[PDB]
Symmetry: C2
Subunit: 81 residues, 2 copies
Amino acid sequence: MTPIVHLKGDANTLKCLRYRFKKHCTLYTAVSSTWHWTGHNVKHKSAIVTLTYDSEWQRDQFLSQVKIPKTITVSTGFMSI
Amino acid sequence: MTPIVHLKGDANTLKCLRYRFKKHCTLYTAVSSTWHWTGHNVKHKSAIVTLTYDSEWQRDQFLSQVKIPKTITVSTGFMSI
């Protein structure tokens, strides 16, 4: 299994946060590209990033290791693979 | 909580599959945009789509309701929100 987190908010702030996490390459297993919810009226201003962890221990540390502004939503969970 | 699925494979086939699911608007809660894994040498040929369900019942039916070719990986799990 592999636990993952979801960061939703402004892509402008997310892009700047990813650059700061580059030095912390040992704080995650891998990072996906940027995606956003879709429906009608062409909605692509929002941006989200999928993050995966190698173990529940790495996810717990990442929670108290990386700082997140109030314009981002942090969600955690576990997926069966 | 909300269970979600991950479909990874060729974006060309995924785009055609999404069009066929348009008629089944009552088979999912919402659909995210397309994203792919990133690392080095510019990797963006792959494409994935995040799907969310309103209940474990909708996810189970979607498993035996939509057809998936062998070029796509199907993964299921539950996230705590």
